[PDB]
Amino acid sequence: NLTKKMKKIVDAVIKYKDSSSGRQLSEVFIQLPSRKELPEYYELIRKPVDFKKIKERIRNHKYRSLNDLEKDVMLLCQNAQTFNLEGSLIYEDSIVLQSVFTSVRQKIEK
Ligand SMILES: O=C(/C=C/N1C[C@H]2C[C@@H]1CN2c1ccccn1)c1ccccc1O
Ligand SMILES: [Zn+2]
């Protein structure tokens, strides 16, 4: 019920495609490179999180409110903006996914 509405919102943010390109913005954010693939990420970033983890925290009842879900999504995006350079595509995708989240959330809340 809360779990299922959290699921719906995340599935739709994951599925979201850029208008002109049709590119699925979430794609790089689904799953972080492993600690051995990219140790720099884990040195720089304090609370690593990817969409796979967010889906696990949902399934495991770790979010008490839609606000707690939003907080972890906004953190994934913040972490992307810290690791990647301003002016990079990945950085900007994380920026855009902030408003995709809030839009999807609103629609679903209604
Ligand atoms: O910043 C994120 C990922 C950046 N990576 C993905 C590609 C582009 C950049 C460097 N990449 C590498 C680097 C080494 C191995 C695999 N991918 C990121 C991914 C999931 C959740 C949050 C994130 O910040
Ligand atoms: Zn519960």
Swiss-Prot record:
Subcellular location: Nucleus
Domain Bromo span(s) in chain numbering: 1-108
Record site: Required for binding to 'Lys-15'-acetylated histone 3: 83-84
Tissue localization of expression: Colocalizes with ZEB1 in E-cadherin-negative cells from established lines, and stroma of normal colon as well as in de-differentiated epithelial cells at the invasion front of colorectal carcinomas (at protein level).
Effect of residue 84 to A: Abolishes binding to 'Lys-15'-acetylated histone H3
Subunit-structure text: Component of the multiprotein chromatin-remodeling complexes SWI/SNF: SWI/SNF-A (BAF), SWI/SNF-B (PBAF) and related complexes. The canonical complex contains a catalytic subunit (either SMARCA4/BRG1/BAF190A or SMARCA2/BRM/BAF190B) and at least SMARCE1, ACTL6A/BAF53, SMARCC1/BAF155, SMARCC2/BAF170, and SMARCB1/SNF5/BAF47. Other subunits specific to each of the complexes may also be present permitting several possible developmental- and tissue-specific combinations.
Its biological purpose: ATPase involved in transcriptional activation and repression of select genes by chromatin remodeling (alteration of DNA-nucleosome topology). Component of SWI/SNF chromatin remodeling complexes that carry out key enzymatic activities, changing chromatin structure by altering DNA-histone contacts within a nucleosome in an ATP-dependent manner. Component of the CREST-BRG1 complex, a multiprotein complex that regulates promoter activation by orchestrating the calcium-dependent release of a repressor complex and the recruitment of an activator complex.
Entry text on domains: The KIKL motif recognizes and binds the NET domain of BRD3.
Family: Belongs to the SNF2/RAD54 helicase family.
Disease affiliated with this protein: Rhabdoid tumor predisposition syndrome 2: A familial cancer syndrome predisposing to renal or extrarenal malignant rhabdoid tumors and to a variety of tumors of the central nervous system, including choroid plexus carcinoma, medulloblastoma, and central primitive neuroectodermal tumors. Rhabdoid tumors are the most aggressive and lethal malignancies occurring in early childhood.
Protein's name in the database: SWI/SNF-related matrix-associated actin-dependent regulator of chromatin subfamily A member 4
Annotated organism of origin: Homo sapiens
Lineage, broadest ranks: Eukaryota, Metazoa, Chordata, Craniata, Vertebrata
Residues of the full protein shown: 1457 to 1566 of 1647
